[PDB]
Design a protein around this ligand. Structure first.
Ligand code: NAG
Ligand code: NAG
Ligand code: NAG
Ligand code: NAG
Ligand code: CU
Ligand code: CU
Ligand code: MN
Ligand code: MN
Ligand code: XE
Ligand code: XE
Ligand code: XE
Ligand code: XE
Lengths: 642, 642
C-alpha cells in the first residue's frame, strides 16, 4: 500500500523524533529539527519496484538536518530497522531552513527591547499593535558566519494588512542561536501608511461591492475521471505519483503516458519539482539591501504550504490530499488540503473545417478534459499558486501564478511630484513605495524520455540567402540540430537566437526515423539584472541561464546549495557545472528558470490580482502520430444529469 | 436599435448589390464584388453618438471593392440615401481579396486540361478522385501584373484529408480573369502518401478509441452574467461592441470598464482587430517558393469564418451571433454561429494567507468569472481560434490557437535515413514532408486610454553598479521611462532589452500622480527569418517589428496594404511610418505582431492538437487601487440532485 516515494506520514515523523531524541535527549541537549524528509531511494531500485511492486522491498530512509547544541548535524535514518546509519557535522558555509518556532520567538524581541520601545514612543505609535517579521540577511563578503536575521516591524490596529504598514527606518539584527538583538540603529523617521482601505477580508470591508458575478453549478454524472490510490494517480492516459517534501513542496514523480497505438505505458518525467526560489529586491540602502529571499532553502516551500480553501483555491468537487510537515521539536503537523486535484473542461483539443471539397460540408471539432494538480505556498507577503497540468495530448504545463501583498517601504512622500531621487520602487499609494524586485523560480525536471538514456538537442533556425539564381526567393529558413556534448553546451539564454530545445531518446525512433522527444515552449524569459559578481547573484547563480542540463546525480537536488541561509554560493548549480560533465545518451536532468521583473503598479495594492505564468512540455516526435486522433469529446448531458 | 458600428445586415448587402448593379447592369458588364464592408464612421461622430445615442444620426456608408470589366473599382455608397458618392479606378499595384466563386471555377480547370490528364494517367492516379486548390503567388520582382494563382491538386478516395495527399511536382498557373491555365510544367513524379489512418472524422474512424473522458453538466441558476442587445455587450464592469467585417473578421469596439471608485465608465480600446496575417513557407523550390499567404487580404478572414459547432467550439450555454458575408455576385450569405460569447469559471482572482500575526488565522481567496468572445477562421488547411477575453480586473487577453492540417509536400522518401539533402521540412509520415513555415498575425489596437490623447512609454529596466562603498550591494536595477516622440521611436523588437511597454494618458493621473495606462505582456516573440529584402518580407514588412505605434489615421487599416494579392509592398505599415509622425499626447494606435515558427512534428499529423498563444493588456496605474478589491466570488450552489 505504501509507495517508496510517498511523503512522510505522521507515524514516520514520530519515529524520527523518537530515534533522534534517544541519541540526543532534550534533558542534556538543545535540539531543533530544521528539515525532515525522505532520502531519495536509488533510481535503479525505484525502476525495479515499478515493474514488480508486490515483490521489491525498499527501506524507508529519512534525511534529517538538525541543529544540536549550536552545531548543524546531517542524520540519515533507516526507518525499517529504526537506526541511525550516519550522523555527520556540516563544516561548510551556510545554515539550514529557518524553523517556524525560532521565528515566533525572534519577532517578540523588539517589543521588549528598550531602544525599540523608545523609538516607537518617539514616533507616537501604539506598541501593543506592532507585529514584527524575520527577514534573511544572506552574505555580503564578511568572514563572520552567524545565524542572524533582520527584524522589520509593522502596524496593525484596524487592519490585518500589516505588510502595507511598515515602520520604516530602523535596523534590527537578531542572532537566532543566542535569541537576542545584537545590533540596533534608529536611522530615519518615516510616516506609517494609513490603514484606511487596506483591508482585504470581506468581513472587514464595507459596500459598495461589485461587479456581481453569476454562480455556476456543475456535476459529473459518472464521477471524477481520476482515481487516487494513496498518492498514485491514474487519469485518462496518464499515471503519476504525487509526493511532498518540507523543503521542495510538491513533487511529481513517475509520470508516464499510455501510448494507445503501441499499447504501452511510456515514461516522460521521473521527477519534477521547484528546487529553489530567488526574490532579489532592488533597494541598495540599509533598509533593504539584504532582502533577496531564497524561499525554499530559507523557509521551506513545504513548511510554508497553506491549506487550500474549498471552492475558491480549487473548483467545486476537487479532491484534496492532506500532508504532514513538522515543527522545530520534530512533532508532525497536519496540513489539511495541502494539494488538490481536479479536471478542467472547455478547451478545444483539435479541429478542422474543410471547405475545399466541392459540394461537401466537412467539419470536426473535439474537446479535451485536462487534469490540474494544485498547491499554494505562501512565504510572508507572497502567495504562489503552483500547478501541474496534464493533457491527453501528452503536454504537461507547469504553471506559477502570483498574488498576495506588495512589500512596502514607508516614506513621507504623498505624491509623485515630490520625488527628488530614485526611490527604488513606484509610489503605489500615499507614503507607500512598492520596491522593485524579481521572482525567479528554478524547476528540476528529471526527464527520462521513454527511458533514462537521453540527449539534449538544440534545433537552431537559420536563415539561408539565395544568391545564385536558383530560386525566385531571396531567402528561407531551415533547421540545424546540434546535440549538446557537455554541460557548458546546454546553458541557454533564451531569446538570443531562435531555436527549439528538445530532450530526446537517441536510442528510440518512430517508424519514419525521428528520435522520440519532448520540447520546451517557454514564456517570455526573465534574465538577471544584478551583476554576476553581486553577492546575492553569486548565491543565486542558478538564475544565470534560463535552461541548464546536467548529468543525473542523486546529491544534486537544490540549485542554491544544500545550505542556503548565509550561503557563500560555493554549492550552486553554477558551481556543479564547472565540472562540465558529458550529457550525451545518458541519464540527464533539465533545469529551467522562470521569472518576472516586478515593477509595482497601483492595481497591485493593497492586494494583487493574479499574475499567471506557464511553460509547456510538448511531445515532439514522441508519438507516431497525433496521440489524441482517436480521443472522443466528453458526452453532452442535459442538466441536471439524470 | 441599429448601432453605427454594427455589421452589415442582409438588407444592406441586398441594397448594395442593387445600387451597384443599377450603374453596372450584368447584361452589359462583368461584375464581381470582392469586398463589401462598412466604411468606418468618423471617430468624433461615433464619440458624439455614444453620449447621445437616441439623438445622433450617422448615415450607414459602405465601401465596395469590385472588379468590373477587368478593372478594379473603389465605390463608396451612402445607404441612407442609396447613392454612390464616389467610384474611382484603382491604378496602383496589387489586387483585391479572391472571391470564393472564381476559386470554385479555377479548381476545376486541371481536371479538363489534357496535359494534366496525361500527367495523372502517367502516375496511375484516379482522375475522378482529384481535388485542386488555388494558392496565391505574390510578386517576385517581375514587371507583369496579372491575377494569376498556382493550382495544386490532391487525392481523395477513402479520405477527406486531402492536404496530406498532395500530387507533388506539377506547376500549374491559372489566370483568374481569363479563367484558364496559362502555364504548365510537369517536373517530378513523387509518390502520393497513403490515405490509411489520415481520417479525422469520428464517423470514418474505427476502434479502439481512448482515453475515455468523463462528462460534465452545468447550469447558471441566475442565467448568463452578460446581455447582448443587438451587437452591444454588457457584462460585469465592461461594455463593448461586437462587429464583423468580411476582410477583418471580428472587431471589438468601444471597450470601456466601469470604475466603481470613480462611478464612471472609462474607455480602454476604441477598436481592436487582426489586420493581416502572413504565413511564409520556407521551401524555395518551384513547388512552394510562392506560398506565403496573407490570409486576410487574399482570402478574407470574415469570408473564411466558419460556423461554430455547439458544445465543441464553445462550451454549452454559450450564446451565438449570426453574421452575413457575401458572394462574388453580391448576394448575402448567412453565416450561422459565426461568433460566440460565454463565461469561464475557476480562476483565482486574488488571494492571501497571512501567518505573520501571532494567534490569528487569516485567509482570503476570491474567484473571478471571465468573459470570452470567440470566432474561428479557416483558410484552406489552417484553423485559427480567435478569442477576446475580458476580466473584471481590467485585463484584456486576446488569444489565437492553431489547429487543422499540415501542408504536406509529397516525396518518395519513407525513412529519415534516406535523406541526402535539405527537404525544407520534417518527415512526419512516409512520403510526407511537413514544410517549415511561420504564422504571423498583426493586431490593430486603437487604444484610447481614458480618452483619445495618449502617449507610448518604454519603461527600461537598467542595471546600476555601486562601486563607491555606499552599499554592501554591488548592484541593483531601476527604471528609466522614455516617451516615444515619433513613429521611429516606437518600433520595438521585443527581447533585445528588458522593458515594459505602456500606453498612457498623460493628461490623467491617479491621486498619487501616476499617469493612467495599460501595459502589454507579450508571449515569447517570433521574429522574421526571411531577409528584409526578400519579396514576401517586403510585402509582409509589417512583421519587421513586434510592436509599432502610429498616429491615428482613418485610412490606415490593413497592415499589408489595401490590395494584397500580387502586392509590391509599397502600401504597408513599414511604408506609412517612413513619414515618422509625432505620437505624443494625441490619438495613437498600437500594432502588435504575434507569431510562431512551425517546425512540424509527428504529433501534428494527420491533424494537429491545439497550439495556444496569448498576450495580456493589463491596467497599469489605470485605477487608484486593485479594481476587484471589492468584487465578491460567485456564490456556491450545491448540485440539486435528482
Ligand atoms: C493601543 O492598542 C490597544 C489594542 O491592542 C488599545 O486597547 C489601546 O486603546 C491603544 N492605545 C491607544 C493610545 O490608542
Ligand atoms: C555527484 O555530484 C557531487 C557534486 O555536486 C559529487 O560530490 C559526486 O562525486 C557526484 N557523483 C558522481 C557520480 O559524479
Ligand atoms: C475511381 O474512383 C471512382 C469513385 O470516384 C470509382 O468508382 C472508380 O472505379 C475508380 N477507378 C479506379 C481506377 O480505382
Ligand atoms: C493618412 O493615411 C494615408 C495612407 O497611409 C496617407 O496617404 C495620408 O497622408 C495620411 N495622413 C497623414 C497626415 O499622415
Ligand atoms: Cu512581485
Ligand atoms: Cu503551422
Ligand atoms: Mn533523466
Ligand atoms: Mn487611440
Ligand atoms: Xe509569476
Ligand atoms: Xe523539454
Ligand atoms: Xe498560434
Ligand atoms: Xe498596451
Amino acid at each position: 500500500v505504501q509507495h517508496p516515494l510517498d511523503p512522510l506520514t505522521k507515524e514516520e515523523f514520530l519515529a524520527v523524533q523518537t530515534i533522534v531524541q534517544n541519541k540526543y535527549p532534550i534533558s542534556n541537549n538543545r535540539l531543533a529539527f530544521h528539515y525532515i524528509g525522505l532520502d531519495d531511494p536509488e533510481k535503479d531500485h525505484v525502476l525495479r519496484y515499478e515493474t514488480h511492486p508486490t515483490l521489491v522491498s525498499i527501506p524507508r530512509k529519512i534525511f534529517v538536518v538538525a541543529i544540536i547544541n549550536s552545531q548543524t548535524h546531517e542524520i540519515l535514518i533507516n526507518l525499517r530497522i529504526r537506526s541511525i546509519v550516519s550522523d555527520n557535522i556540516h563544516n561548510g558555509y551556510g545554515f539550514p531552513i529557518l524553523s517556524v518556532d525560532e521565528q515566533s520567538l525572534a519577532i517578540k524581541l523588539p517589543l521588549k527591547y528598550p531602544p525599540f520601545i523608545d523609538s516607537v514612543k518617539k514616533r507616537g505609535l501604539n506598541l501593543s499593535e506592532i507585529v514584527c517579521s524575520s527577514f534573511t540577511m544572506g552574505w555580503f563578503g564578511e568572514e563572520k558566519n552567524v545565524r542572524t536575521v533582520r527584524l522589520d516591524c509593522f502596524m496593525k490596529e484596524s487592519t490585518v494588512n500589516i505588510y502595507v504598514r511598515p515602520i520604516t527606518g530602523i535596523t534590527i539584527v537578531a542572532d537566532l542561536d543566542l535569541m537576542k538583538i545584537v545590533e540596533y540603529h534608529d536611522r530615519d523617521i518615516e510616516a506609517v501608511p494609513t490603514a484606511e482601505n487596506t483591508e482585504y477580508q470581506v468581513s472587514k470591508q464595507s459596500p459598495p461591492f461589485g461587479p456581481k458575478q453569476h454562480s455556476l453549478t456543475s456535476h459529473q454524472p459518472q464521477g471524477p475521471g481520476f482515481q487516487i490510490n494513496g498518492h498514485s494517480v491514474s487519469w485518462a492516459n496518464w499515471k503519476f505519483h504525487i509526493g511532498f517534501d518540507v523543503r521542495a513542496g510538491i513533487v511529481i514523480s513517475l509520470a508516464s503516458i499510455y501510448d494507445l497505438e503501441k499499447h504501452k505505458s511510456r515514461r516522460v518525467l521521473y521527477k519534477g519539482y521547484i528546487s529553489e526560489l530567488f526574490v532579489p529586491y532592488q533597494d541598495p540602502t540599509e533598509e533593504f539591501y539584504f532582502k533577496t529571499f531564497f524561499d525554499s532553502g530559507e523557509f521551506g516551500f513545504g513548511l510554508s504550504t497553506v491549506s487550500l480553501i474549498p471552492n475558491r483555491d480549487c473548483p467545486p468537487h476537487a479532491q484534496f490530499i492532506d500532508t504532514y510537515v513538522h515543527s522545530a521539536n520534530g512533532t508532525p503537523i497536519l496540513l489539511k488540503n495541502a494539494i488538490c486535484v481536479f479536471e478542467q473542461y472547455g478547451n478545444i483539443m483539435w479541429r478542422h473545417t474543410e471547405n475545399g471539397i466541392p459540394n461537401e460540408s466537412i467539419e470536426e471539432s473535439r474537446t479535451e478534459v485536462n487534469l490540474i494538480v494544485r498547491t499554494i505556498v505562501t512565504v510572508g507577503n507572497y502567495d504562489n499558486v503552483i500547478d501541474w497540468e496534464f493533457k491527453a495530448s501528452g503536454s504537461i504545463k507547469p504553471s506559477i501564478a502570483l498574488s498576495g501583498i506588495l512589500e512596502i517601504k514607508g516614506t513621507n512622500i504623498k505624491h509623485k511630484d515630490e520625488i527628488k531621487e530614485d526611490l527604488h520602487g513606484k509610489l503605489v499609494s500615499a507614503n507607500s513605495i512598492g520596491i522593485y524586485h524579481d521572482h525567479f523560480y528554478i524547476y528540476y525536471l528529471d526527464f527520462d524520455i521513454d527511458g533514462t538514456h537521453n540527449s539534449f538537442e538544440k534545433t537552431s533556425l537559420k536563415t539561408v540567402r539565395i544568391k545564385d539564381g536558383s530560386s525566385k526567393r531571396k531567402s528561407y529558413w531551415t533547421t540545424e540540430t546540434q546535440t549538446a556534448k557537455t554541460e557548458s553546451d546546454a546553458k541557454i539564454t533564451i531569446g538570443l537566437a531562435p531555436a527549439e530545445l528538445v530532450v530526446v531518446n537517441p536510442n528510440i525512433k518512430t517508424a519514419v526515423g525521428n528520435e522520440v522527444g519532448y520540447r520546451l515552449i517557454p514564456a517570455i524569459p526573465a534574465h538577471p539584472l544584478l551583476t554576476e559578481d553581486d553577492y546575492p547573484q553569486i548565491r543565486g547563480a542558478f538564475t544565470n541561464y534560463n535552461v541548464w542540463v546536467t548529468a543525473y546525480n542523486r546529491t544534486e537536488k537544490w540549485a542554491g546549495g544544500l545550505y542556503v541561509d548565509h550561503s557563500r554560493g560555493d554549492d550552486t548549480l553554477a558551481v556543479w557545472t564547472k565540472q562540465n560533465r558529458e550529457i550525451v545518451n545518458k541519464d540527464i536532468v533539465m533545469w529551467h528558470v522562470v521569472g518576472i521583473h516586478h515593477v509595482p503598479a497601483q492595481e497591485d495594492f493593497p492586494i494583487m490580482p493574479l499574475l499567471s505564468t506557464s511553460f509547456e512540455l510538448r511531445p515532439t516526435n514522441f508519438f507516431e502520430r497525433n496521440p489524441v486522433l482517436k480521443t472522443l469529446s466528453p458526452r453532452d448531458v442535459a442538466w441536471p444529469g439524470c
